[PDB]
């Protein structure tokens, strides 16, 4: 059918007019197919013959699907699409199974010949003009135009969507306790009614839809659980990921590892513990797709650990709006975090992992906070509410960090859970200068042209040292200088730098870095018993800084 | 009750806003649906089709002394693409000098004036749904929308008529309109002041707008807090070094600053804890600088062609410092914010309070909101700001990593 729904007024982009793309001369066979295909469509009101007036045209083509000798009609709307107004956006997200509410009875109804059952604005049809060419550019071809939403046109997905929304509205009002999910041409229906009433409610729905030009499958034609939906396997009381097969292979290509990471990240939705970090590392620099990449000992271990996890089929439960959501997070390793969300202890609605920030100097407290934030966002999207957190960090550790950190931070309602490895700060800078501790005045310089540099210090105990560095930057020398002072100092130290850069890094109590150097410094800071770090403006009559600036600057301009 | 609509126009080349809707809680979605289905019945808004490619974000807030959900539309994009907002509202310089200023929400007035038919499209917004089960509920405005700077610009004519009697009766009272609010300042005793506000609400009442003893500001008692120089008997190298740094920095703002005498004390590689007696010379320089820091700042002047910028620092113990300038260091205003009894455990809560306070002051002083540099993670702010937000307006903001020194310079 063709829905009796009021049409959506459509228009071309402001300073633009309809397409006028000439018809390529087509094969005798392809021309025959188009004629019959179009005759059928015309008979169903999908298209209509047009006068010579209409100056618009869009190319037409014909292709046959194999294992069958049945032709298909392809229209190239690339041009019309460039000229068509921008529309809204069908949806801002895809439903996640974990968000699906528990309902005794569920039915899937797909809207049949979707796009073709919806009318197109009459004032716009003129722009959908296409021509079946005559055997060898004989004379005028048979000219048609669409009356319905053309397959592959810009506004079809959005217009169909709206039409369905308008159609479903009255039924929604009269049946507030029934869930209907609109997804493309599909339609999923859920209720807490016993079959009987539900099949009746379904039938009533279909009748309302049919009364509006939309065909659906009848009982015996409806799909049965499990439902294989957009990568998922849906059962009435549980869900999981579509059967994942980890390819047993000797020699892996970039493409193979890419697909592997993909399936793994995908499986991470329900399978807890999946680690992908070591595999991603191999995908650095890549340069090729068919190039084979040898697996590191670490990747082989990671892959093996993943296999074990995937050997045992895991399932997810559905959402109960009456119960609270609980999210638990655990540290898997170096910058690796996993979480799980449930309502009833250990009956997971969903799983996930977190492993961001490319080592831009961070600690476990910052990471945990980031993971909490990420989880919070997805919970709002999926369930419309934030979960209660179970964190492997002491309230004391948390308060100490937050109160003293420069950035405003805030975790929703959480509770400590003794699940090792626990999150903690590995070292802490002193609040005031240490009495009876050597004071190192450090500094570093680097020549912009030569990339050569010097790093060193001078103490109050009269000590001195100056190292020469190759292929360095000002930043690296400043950090080198601090590293030097930490190496030659012992348990208690006061360090005075002129680098806001280094002060910034160290103050944030990092425990991980992409910089081998910063790691040296961290490793060294952990060993100390007491460390005080102060800053002074450079190029001033400031005793100490004024002097290190000499030996470090000499020979390096 | 339609009238002759004011034809609105986007900037040449500029196109309507296409800003994504951020996920909202079920609680807020429920509230917005209830509010919107009611505004639709009243003809203020109407459903729209997919042929409307525009979108503006929407949220749900609750003002102070209010337990009823309110709709807050984030028109920041549309506002930037409008002006028009052409015929603006002049900012009175007398407002910042009043003994007291009262803020009154007059947003309910805008729903009387119909919006230009050809502009309506640009006011489109979406009510999202949980787990994207349902496609968003789409609407657009038929009347002047709250939050759009075009509404007060258009409503000026009617606002001046409403206020004419009250104005002639109290020609010493200053009335400033900014977005959905009215700023009313007088030098009257608090008693008369409040009495005059009550009278003003009656005038507004006669025009259908119930304008509810609102937030009371005292711009007189606003004094730019200095940079603060310590006051100790004995000083260490560390203290002088901490002082030299602080002054070295401040010297970039206040020209009259000197540091040569103090720096003379810091010579040789001494231990940080070593006590150092200050020379009588350094004593003067120090005292002399403190005097400079008491007074404003010579050279800085508000330039109406340039944007206002506000930086905030977390000081700890519920304390926050902030600075307003148009060009870095050239501080037009500096201040402080201390957590009010309740937020005893929330950084985001305190930061949103501080932002609103600073924004309010900017409106009073310059009649413009500053662009904020927020010491927080975007996603965190994005997730929580609406939880404690109570203003009808929304300033522009960006997220930054506070330079550790800056905290000290402004530390109190
Ligand atoms: C109300 C729709 C619905 N609820 N539940 C939870 C049952 O307790 C399920 C699992 C079977 C549904 O079915 C879908 C089937 C397909 C398919 N094919 C897709 C989606 C979605 N989203 C949902």
mmCIF file with all atom_site columns, N, CA and C and ligand atoms in Angstrom, chain A residues 94-97 100-108 179-181 183 186 188-191 223 225 227-230 234-239 318, chain B residues 131, ligand 1:
data_model
loop_
_atom_site.group_PDB
_atom_site.id
_atom_site.type_symbol
_atom_site.label_atom_id
_atom_site.label_alt_id
_atom_site.label_comp_id
_atom_site.label_asym_id
_atom_site.label_entity_id
_atom_site.label_seq_id
_atom_site.pdbx_PDB_ins_code
_atom_site.Cartn_x
_atom_site.Cartn_y
_atom_site.Cartn_z
_atom_site.occupancy
_atom_site.B_iso_or_equiv
_atom_site.pdbx_formal_charge
_atom_site.auth_seq_id
_atom_site.auth_comp_id
_atom_site.auth_asym_id
_atom_site.auth_atom_id
_atom_site.pdbx_PDB_model_num
ATOM   1   N N   . UNK A 1 94  ? 21.553 3.705   19.264 1.00 0.00 ? 94  UNK A N   1
ATOM   2   C CA  . UNK A 1 94  ? 20.898 2.412   19.005 1.00 0.00 ? 94  UNK A CA  1
ATOM   3   C C   . UNK A 1 94  ? 20.551 1.793   20.362 1.00 0.00 ? 94  UNK A C   1
ATOM   4   N N   . UNK A 1 95  ? 19.358 1.200   20.568 1.00 0.00 ? 95  UNK A N   1
ATOM   5   C CA  . UNK A 1 95  ? 19.086 0.594   21.875 1.00 0.00 ? 95  UNK A CA  1
ATOM   6   C C   . UNK A 1 95  ? 20.144 -0.438  22.256 1.00 0.00 ? 95  UNK A C   1
ATOM   7   N N   . UNK A 1 96  ? 20.550 -0.455  23.521 1.00 0.00 ? 96  UNK A N   1
ATOM   8   C CA  . UNK A 1 96  ? 21.501 -1.448  23.986 1.00 0.00 ? 96  UNK A CA  1
ATOM   9   C C   . UNK A 1 96  ? 20.652 -2.523  24.676 1.00 0.00 ? 96  UNK A C   1
ATOM   10  N N   . UNK A 1 97  ? 20.916 -3.822  24.421 1.00 0.00 ? 97  UNK A N   1
ATOM   11  C CA  . UNK A 1 97  ? 20.143 -4.886  25.077 1.00 0.00 ? 97  UNK A CA  1
ATOM   12  C C   . UNK A 1 97  ? 20.015 -4.716  26.584 1.00 0.00 ? 97  UNK A C   1
ATOM   13  N N   . UNK A 1 100 ? 17.083 -2.984  27.761 1.00 0.00 ? 100 UNK A N   1
ATOM   14  C CA  . UNK A 1 100 ? 15.773 -3.571  27.486 1.00 0.00 ? 100 UNK A CA  1
ATOM   15  C C   . UNK A 1 100 ? 15.121 -4.000  28.752 1.00 0.00 ? 100 UNK A C   1
ATOM   16  N N   . UNK A 1 101 ? 13.882 -3.558  28.945 1.00 0.00 ? 101 UNK A N   1
ATOM   17  C CA  . UNK A 1 101 ? 13.157 -3.887  30.160 1.00 0.00 ? 101 UNK A CA  1
ATOM   18  C C   . UNK A 1 101 ? 12.672 -5.308  30.090 1.00 0.00 ? 101 UNK A C   1
ATOM   19  N N   . UNK A 1 102 ? 12.535 -5.969  31.251 1.00 0.00 ? 102 UNK A N   1
ATOM   20  C CA  . UNK A 1 102 ? 12.021 -7.335  31.288 1.00 0.00 ? 102 UNK A CA  1
ATOM   21  C C   . UNK A 1 102 ? 10.512 -7.284  31.057 1.00 0.00 ? 102 UNK A C   1
ATOM   22  N N   . UNK A 1 103 ? 10.038 -8.050  30.064 1.00 0.00 ? 103 UNK A N   1
ATOM   23  C CA  . UNK A 1 103 ? 8.640  -8.158  29.669 1.00 0.00 ? 103 UNK A CA  1
ATOM   24  C C   . UNK A 1 103 ? 8.394  -9.608  29.390 1.00 0.00 ? 103 UNK A C   1
ATOM   25  N N   . UNK A 1 104 ? 6.931  -10.290 30.107 1.00 0.00 ? 104 UNK A N   1
ATOM   26  C CA  . UNK A 1 104 ? 6.730  -11.706 29.847 1.00 0.00 ? 104 UNK A CA  1
ATOM   27  C C   . UNK A 1 104 ? 6.705  -12.025 28.363 1.00 0.00 ? 104 UNK A C   1
ATOM   28  N N   . UNK A 1 105 ? 6.110  -11.144 27.554 1.00 0.00 ? 105 UNK A N   1
ATOM   29  C CA  . UNK A 1 105 ? 5.968  -11.407 26.128 1.00 0.00 ? 105 UNK A CA  1
ATOM   30  C C   . UNK A 1 105 ? 6.523  -10.311 25.215 1.00 0.00 ? 105 UNK A C   1
ATOM   31  N N   . UNK A 1 106 ? 7.288  -10.728 24.193 1.00 0.00 ? 106 UNK A N   1
ATOM   32  C CA  . UNK A 1 106 ? 7.948  -9.845  23.230 1.00 0.00 ? 106 UNK A CA  1
ATOM   33  C C   . UNK A 1 106 ? 7.696  -10.328 21.799 1.00 0.00 ? 106 UNK A C   1
ATOM   34  N N   . UNK A 1 107 ? 7.432  -9.380  20.886 1.00 0.00 ? 107 UNK A N   1
ATOM   35  C CA  . UNK A 1 107 ? 7.197  -9.669  19.473 1.00 0.00 ? 107 UNK A CA  1
ATOM   36  C C   . UNK A 1 107 ? 7.959  -8.706  18.557 1.00 0.00 ? 107 UNK A C   1
ATOM   37  N N   . UNK A 1 108 ? 8.528  -9.241  17.473 1.00 0.00 ? 108 UNK A N   1
ATOM   38  C CA  . UNK A 1 108 ? 9.213  -8.443  16.460 1.00 0.00 ? 108 UNK A CA  1
ATOM   39  C C   . UNK A 1 108 ? 8.308  -8.409  15.235 1.00 0.00 ? 108 UNK A C   1
ATOM   40  N N   . UNK A 1 179 ? 5.600  -1.239  25.363 1.00 0.00 ? 179 UNK A N   1
ATOM   41  C CA  . UNK A 1 179 ? 6.817  -0.678  24.817 1.00 0.00 ? 179 UNK A CA  1
ATOM   42  C C   . UNK A 1 179 ? 6.978  -1.023  23.376 1.00 0.00 ? 179 UNK A C   1
ATOM   43  N N   . UNK A 1 180 ? 7.222  0.001   22.575 1.00 0.00 ? 180 UNK A N   1
ATOM   44  C CA  . UNK A 1 180 ? 7.438  -0.143  21.151 1.00 0.00 ? 180 UNK A CA  1
ATOM   45  C C   . UNK A 1 180 ? 8.748  0.530   20.851 1.00 0.00 ? 180 UNK A C   1
ATOM   46  N N   . UNK A 1 181 ? 9.643  -0.213  20.215 1.00 0.00 ? 181 UNK A N   1
ATOM   47  C CA  . UNK A 1 181 ? 10.932 0.299   19.808 1.00 0.00 ? 181 UNK A CA  1
ATOM   48  C C   . UNK A 1 181 ? 10.929 0.441   18.305 1.00 0.00 ? 181 UNK A C   1
ATOM   49  N N   . UNK A 1 183 ? 13.077 0.908   15.024 1.00 0.00 ? 183 UNK A N   1
ATOM   50  C CA  . UNK A 1 183 ? 14.434 0.774   14.542 1.00 0.00 ? 183 UNK A CA  1
ATOM   51  C C   . UNK A 1 183 ? 14.418 0.517   13.064 1.00 0.00 ? 183 UNK A C   1
ATOM   52  N N   . UNK A 1 186 ? 12.170 -2.000  11.340 1.00 0.00 ? 186 UNK A N   1
ATOM   53  C CA  . UNK A 1 186 ? 11.718 -2.960  12.339 1.00 0.00 ? 186 UNK A CA  1
ATOM   54  C C   . UNK A 1 186 ? 10.874 -2.276  13.390 1.00 0.00 ? 186 UNK A C   1
ATOM   55  N N   . UNK A 1 188 ? 9.787  -3.514  17.471 1.00 0.00 ? 188 UNK A N   1
ATOM   56  C CA  . UNK A 1 188 ? 9.774  -4.494  18.573 1.00 0.00 ? 188 UNK A CA  1
ATOM   57  C C   . UNK A 1 188 ? 8.759  -4.079  19.590 1.00 0.00 ? 188 UNK A C   1
ATOM   58  N N   . UNK A 1 189 ? 7.931  -5.036  20.036 1.00 0.00 ? 189 UNK A N   1
ATOM   59  C CA  . UNK A 1 189 ? 6.844  -4.759  20.966 1.00 0.00 ? 189 UNK A CA  1
ATOM   60  C C   . UNK A 1 189 ? 6.962  -5.598  22.221 1.00 0.00 ? 189 UNK A C   1
ATOM   61  N N   . UNK A 1 190 ? 6.822  -4.956  23.374 1.00 0.00 ? 190 UNK A N   1
ATOM   62  C CA  . UNK A 1 190 ? 6.876  -5.640  24.656 1.00 0.00 ? 190 UNK A CA  1
ATOM   63  C C   . UNK A 1 190 ? 5.755  -5.244  25.589 1.00 0.00 ? 190 UNK A C   1
ATOM   64  N N   . UNK A 1 191 ? 5.257  -6.224  26.357 1.00 0.00 ? 191 UNK A N   1
ATOM   65  C CA  . UNK A 1 191 ? 4.203  -6.044  27.356 1.00 0.00 ? 191 UNK A CA  1
ATOM   66  C C   . UNK A 1 191 ? 4.395  -7.014  28.493 1.00 0.00 ? 191 UNK A C   1
ATOM   67  N N   . UNK A 1 223 ? 9.303  -13.739 13.605 1.00 0.00 ? 223 UNK A N   1
ATOM   68  C CA  . UNK A 1 223 ? 10.527 -14.394 14.042 1.00 0.00 ? 223 UNK A CA  1
ATOM   69  C C   . UNK A 1 223 ? 10.319 -14.927 15.458 1.00 0.00 ? 223 UNK A C   1
ATOM   70  N N   . UNK A 1 225 ? 12.383 -16.220 19.226 1.00 0.00 ? 225 UNK A N   1
ATOM   71  C CA  . UNK A 1 225 ? 13.664 -16.164 19.961 1.00 0.00 ? 225 UNK A CA  1
ATOM   72  C C   . UNK A 1 225 ? 14.493 -17.442 19.822 1.00 0.00 ? 225 UNK A C   1
ATOM   73  N N   . UNK A 1 227 ? 16.744 -13.954 18.813 1.00 0.00 ? 227 UNK A N   1
ATOM   74  C CA  . UNK A 1 227 ? 16.727 -12.922 17.787 1.00 0.00 ? 227 UNK A CA  1
ATOM   75  C C   . UNK A 1 227 ? 18.150 -12.513 17.539 1.00 0.00 ? 227 UNK A C   1
ATOM   76  N N   . UNK A 1 228 ? 18.586 -12.563 16.293 1.00 0.00 ? 228 UNK A N   1
ATOM   77  C CA  . UNK A 1 228 ? 19.933 -12.141 15.970 1.00 0.00 ? 228 UNK A CA  1
ATOM   78  C C   . UNK A 1 228 ? 19.830 -10.705 15.519 1.00 0.00 ? 228 UNK A C   1
ATOM   79  N N   . UNK A 1 229 ? 19.979 -9.769  16.473 1.00 0.00 ? 229 UNK A N   1
ATOM   80  C CA  . UNK A 1 229 ? 19.836 -8.333  16.232 1.00 0.00 ? 229 UNK A CA  1
ATOM   81  C C   . UNK A 1 229 ? 21.142 -7.584  16.350 1.00 0.00 ? 229 UNK A C   1
ATOM   82  N N   . UNK A 1 230 ? 21.489 -6.803  15.330 1.00 0.00 ? 230 UNK A N   1
ATOM   83  C CA  . UNK A 1 230 ? 22.672 -5.932  15.305 1.00 0.00 ? 230 UNK A CA  1
ATOM   84  C C   . UNK A 1 230 ? 23.887 -6.369  16.146 1.00 0.00 ? 230 UNK A C   1
ATOM   85  N N   . UNK A 1 234 ? 19.377 -12.230 21.190 1.00 0.00 ? 234 UNK A N   1
ATOM   86  C CA  . UNK A 1 234 ? 18.377 -11.911 22.199 1.00 0.00 ? 234 UNK A CA  1
ATOM   87  C C   . UNK A 1 234 ? 17.490 -13.086 22.545 1.00 0.00 ? 234 UNK A C   1
ATOM   88  N N   . UNK A 1 235 ? 17.386 -13.407 23.835 1.00 0.00 ? 235 UNK A N   1
ATOM   89  C CA  . UNK A 1 235 ? 16.540 -14.479 24.355 1.00 0.00 ? 235 UNK A CA  1
ATOM   90  C C   . UNK A 1 235 ? 15.500 -13.761 25.208 1.00 0.00 ? 235 UNK A C   1
ATOM   91  N N   . UNK A 1 236 ? 14.342 -14.351 25.579 1.00 0.00 ? 236 UNK A N   1
ATOM   92  C CA  . UNK A 1 236 ? 13.372 -13.564 26.360 1.00 0.00 ? 236 UNK A CA  1
ATOM   93  C C   . UNK A 1 236 ? 13.847 -13.078 27.723 1.00 0.00 ? 236 UNK A C   1
ATOM   94  N N   . UNK A 1 237 ? 14.807 -13.778 28.351 1.00 0.00 ? 237 UNK A N   1
ATOM   95  C CA  . UNK A 1 237 ? 15.268 -13.421 29.692 1.00 0.00 ? 237 UNK A CA  1
ATOM   96  C C   . UNK A 1 237 ? 16.768 -13.152 29.827 1.00 0.00 ? 237 UNK A C   1
ATOM   97  N N   . UNK A 1 238 ? 17.500 -13.188 28.709 1.00 0.00 ? 238 UNK A N   1
ATOM   98  C CA  . UNK A 1 238 ? 18.938 -12.985 28.698 1.00 0.00 ? 238 UNK A CA  1
ATOM   99  C C   . UNK A 1 238 ? 19.418 -12.565 27.328 1.00 0.00 ? 238 UNK A C   1
ATOM   100 N N   . UNK A 1 239 ? 20.629 -12.008 27.252 1.00 0.00 ? 239 UNK A N   1
ATOM   101 C CA  . UNK A 1 239 ? 21.234 -11.584 25.992 1.00 0.00 ? 239 UNK A CA  1
ATOM   102 C C   . UNK A 1 239 ? 22.708 -11.891 26.043 1.00 0.00 ? 239 UNK A C   1
ATOM   103 N N   . UNK A 1 318 ? 18.288 -8.618  31.818 1.00 0.00 ? 318 UNK A N   1
ATOM   104 C CA  . UNK A 1 318 ? 17.561 -7.401  31.440 1.00 0.00 ? 318 UNK A CA  1
ATOM   105 C C   . UNK A 1 318 ? 17.307 -6.450  32.603 1.00 0.00 ? 318 UNK A C   1
ATOM   106 N N   . UNK B 2 131 ? 17.350 4.808   26.315 1.00 0.00 ? 131 UNK B N   1
ATOM   107 C CA  . UNK B 2 131 ? 17.820 3.683   25.524 1.00 0.00 ? 131 UNK B CA  1
ATOM   108 C C   . UNK B 2 131 ? 17.400 3.796   24.077 1.00 0.00 ? 131 UNK B C   1
HETATM 109 C C1  . LIG C 3 .   ? 10.489 -4.600  24.028 1.00 0.00 ? 1   LIG C C1  1
HETATM 110 C C2  . LIG C 3 .   ? 11.497 -5.261  23.063 1.00 0.00 ? 1   LIG C C2  1
HETATM 111 C C3  . LIG C 3 .   ? 12.290 -6.328  23.785 1.00 0.00 ? 1   LIG C C3  1
HETATM 112 N N1  . LIG C 3 .   ? 12.414 -6.463  25.097 1.00 0.00 ? 1   LIG C N1  1
HETATM 113 N N2  . LIG C 3 .   ? 13.193 -7.543  25.407 1.00 0.00 ? 1   LIG C N2  1
HETATM 114 C C4  . LIG C 3 .   ? 13.485 -7.909  26.729 1.00 0.00 ? 1   LIG C C4  1
HETATM 115 C C5  . LIG C 3 .   ? 12.661 -9.229  26.998 1.00 0.00 ? 1   LIG C C5  1
HETATM 116 O O1  . LIG C 3 .   ? 12.450 -9.518  28.405 1.00 0.00 ? 1   LIG C O1  1
HETATM 117 C C6  . LIG C 3 .   ? 13.631 -8.188  24.301 1.00 0.00 ? 1   LIG C C6  1
HETATM 118 C C7  . LIG C 3 .   ? 14.521 -9.453  24.200 1.00 0.00 ? 1   LIG C C7  1
HETATM 119 C C8  . LIG C 3 .   ? 13.999 -10.434 23.321 1.00 0.00 ? 1   LIG C C8  1
HETATM 120 C C9  . LIG C 3 .   ? 13.067 -7.414  23.255 1.00 0.00 ? 1   LIG C C9  1
HETATM 121 O O2  . LIG C 3 .   ? 13.236 -7.750  21.879 1.00 0.00 ? 1   LIG C O2  1
HETATM 122 C C10 . LIG C 3 .   ? 13.981 -7.230  20.882 1.00 0.00 ? 1   LIG C C10 1
HETATM 123 C C11 . LIG C 3 .   ? 14.147 -7.969  19.619 1.00 0.00 ? 1   LIG C C11 1
HETATM 124 C C12 . LIG C 3 .   ? 14.956 -7.361  18.579 1.00 0.00 ? 1   LIG C C12 1
HETATM 125 C C13 . LIG C 3 .   ? 15.150 -8.029  17.360 1.00 0.00 ? 1   LIG C C13 1
HETATM 126 N N3  . LIG C 3 .   ? 15.314 -8.596  16.326 1.00 0.00 ? 1   LIG C N3  1
HETATM 127 C C14 . LIG C 3 .   ? 15.604 -6.091  18.779 1.00 0.00 ? 1   LIG C C14 1
HETATM 128 C C15 . LIG C 3 .   ? 15.373 -5.432  20.073 1.00 0.00 ? 1   LIG C C15 1
HETATM 129 C C16 . LIG C 3 .   ? 15.833 -4.200  20.579 1.00 0.00 ? 1   LIG C C16 1
HETATM 130 N N4  . LIG C 3 .   ? 16.224 -3.151  21.011 1.00 0.00 ? 1   LIG C N4  1
HETATM 131 C C17 . LIG C 3 .   ? 14.568 -5.981  21.090 1.00 0.00 ? 1   LIG C C17 1
#
